[PDB]
Structure 1
Amino acid sequence: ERVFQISFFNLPTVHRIRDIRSEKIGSLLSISGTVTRTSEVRPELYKASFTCDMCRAIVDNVEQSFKYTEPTFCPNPSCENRAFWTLNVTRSRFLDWQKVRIQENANEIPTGSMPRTLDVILRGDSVERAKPGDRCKFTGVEIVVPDVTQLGLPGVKPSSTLDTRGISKTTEGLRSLGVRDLTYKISFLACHVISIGSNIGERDQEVFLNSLS
């Protein structure tokens, strides 16, 4: 199956990198910035294939929601264990992935502040349309990415305990539970990339004249 990508462009407003707020997470939006760093084109696990460890039958086309997931269904009737799996990289399906770092434009910087950066992810055909040192307008979704950096920051960091109210227990004998941190940073996933001129306002001449009207 061919993987389809919808690219939106010509949004009415373009937002500054400092205008990014938490209420826009999960929303289509346009930003502009100067590309400072670009990464190698890499494969991303789109549709993985796993084999259950003791069933040893193949399953495929399991969707990946950002961080790496494993299925717990296992429609094979052989097992009674959901958690244990292994992943093969050859039968898995991949997507193109690039991380490009962008910076605040010079005129967009406030009076005394330093420029701040943002890591925006390009996938599919949008990969390698951004080059270091130019001004690019990205249209895409504001996403949120796990961040272990915020551990020492002041303020209460949200945590996530598993609720235990409908579990029957016995004190038979022979009390451990797992809690995960909810700390995140804002990133961007751009479906469309357009390169604005770095100025205020392809070697063959036949190529160049065809672009002009």
Structure 2
Amino acid sequence: TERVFQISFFNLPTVHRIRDIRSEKIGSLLSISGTVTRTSEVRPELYKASFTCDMCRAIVDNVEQSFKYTEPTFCPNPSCENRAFWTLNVTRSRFLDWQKVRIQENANEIPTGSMPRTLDVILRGDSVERAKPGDRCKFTGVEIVVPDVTQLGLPGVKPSSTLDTRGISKTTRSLGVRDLTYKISFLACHVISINERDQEVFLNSLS
């Protein structure tokens, strides 16, 4: 259909630690480093979903799934005028390769008395399986946020969202309340570590 392109930035001026990750840098390019502990099996991630409407059994395709399962809003046929009822058909959909790496802090980066921090890096596209457990790898990519329901019970005023009930024309319970609790994750577009059994291939690629 269409080739998906992966822009892989690298050679950033600075490399950040896991504990240097802060919420100001959400959705920004940056490089981190860490020791890989666990890697997921590459798994298919819904990239361009196809949807079938229950009223109009047409097929709407190329529904871009940015970061989460998102049904469309308008049907292709003008008569249906439906927005909330759709079915995902998996064969007629498109997928990407997704691996979730877990990275601990390097042994030389852990502060005094503190315990190592862990981060969930998301490898996508051709960067999957480029990191294996034990290796110290540096990742370049986006610092993103993912839903974290475990923040319940934590101290503080956890953010929440409510639908705006003005300009709505009541006649004389429509809550729509969600929990805006997130945790910082990483989406890597480039992995480099910081099968050789053949002699000639080893000598060929060497200065």
Secondary structure at 2:55 match in 1: coil
Higher mean displacement: 175-184 or 35-44 = 175-184
Within 1, Cα distance between the matches of 2:36 and 2:69? 28
Within 2, Cα distance between the matches of 1:201 and 1:93? 32
Q: CA deviation digits over 1:36-72, x for unaligned, max 9?
A: 0001000000000001111111110001121211011
Within 2, Cα distance between the matches of 1:177 and 1:201? 58
Q: Sequence identity, in percent?
A: 100
Q: Which residue of 2 aligns with 1:160?
A: 161
Within 1, Cα distance between the matches of 2:180 and 2:195? 44
Q: Which residue of 1 aligns with 2:112?
A: 111
Q: Is the 8 A contact 2:12 2:30 kept in 1?
A: yes
Report the alpha carbon displacement of residue 17 of structure 1 after superposing the two structures with TM.
0.5
Secondary structure at 1:142 match in 2: strand
Within 1, Cα distance between the matches of 2:195 and 2:27? 33
Secondary structure at 2:94 match in 1: strand
Q: CA deviation digits over 1:4-31, x for unaligned, max 9?
A: 0100111011000000000000110000
Report the alpha carbon displacement of residue 201 of structure 1 after superposing the two structures with TM.
21
Within 1, Cα distance between the matches of 2:47 and 2:82? 25
Q: CA deviation digits over 1:79-126, x for unaligned, max 9?
A: 132111111000000001000100000000000001010000000110
Secondary structure at 2:66 match in 1: coil
Q: Is the 8 A contact 2:60 2:76 kept in 1?
A: no
After superposition, the Cα gap between the structure-2 partners of 1:12 and 1:201, relative to the gap in structure 1 and judged at 3 Å, is: farther
The answer for unaligned runs of 5 or more in structure 1 is none
Within 1, Cα distance between the matches of 2:154 and 2:146? 17
* 1:130-141 equivalence runs, <5 A: 130-141=131-142
Within 2, Cα distance between the matches of 1:124 and 1:18? 27
The answer for unaligned runs of 5 or more in structure 2 is none
Report the alpha carbon displacement of residue 75 of structure 1 after superposing the two structures with TM.
2.5
Report the alpha carbon displacement of residue 185 of structure 1 after superposing the two structures with TM.
0.2
Q: Which residue of 2 aligns with 1:10?
A: 11
RMSD between superposed Cα atoms in Å: 1.8
Q: Which residue of 2 aligns with 1:202?
A: 196
Secondary structure at 1:23 match in 2: helix
Higher mean displacement: 68-77 or 186-195 = 68-77
Query: After the TM superposition, which segments of 4 or more aligned residues of structure 1 sit over 6 Å from their partners?
Result: none
* 1:27-176 equivalence runs, <5 A: 27-171=28-172, 175-176=173-174
Q: Report whether the alignment pairs 1:19 with 2:29.
A: no
Within 1, Cα distance between the matches of 2:124 and 2:31? 16
Within 1, Cα distance between the matches of 2:174 and 2:124? 41
Within 2, Cα distance between the matches of 1:148 and 1:42? 23
Q: Which has the higher helix share?
A: 1
- TM norm structure 2: 0.97
Within 2, Cα distance between the matches of 1:201 and 1:138? 23
Within 1, Cα distance between the matches of 2:61 and 2:3? 15
Q: Which residue of 2 aligns with 1:187?
A: 185
- Matched pairs, number: 206
Higher mean displacement: 63-72 or 44-53 = 63-72
After superposition, the Cα gap between the structure-2 partners of 1:26 and 1:155, relative to the gap in structure 1 and judged at 3 Å, is: same
Q: CA deviation digits over 1:148-168, x for unaligned, max 9?
A: 000110100000000011111
Within 2, Cα distance between the matches of 1:11 and 1:111? 28
Within 1, Cα distance between the matches of 2:198 and 2:81? 65
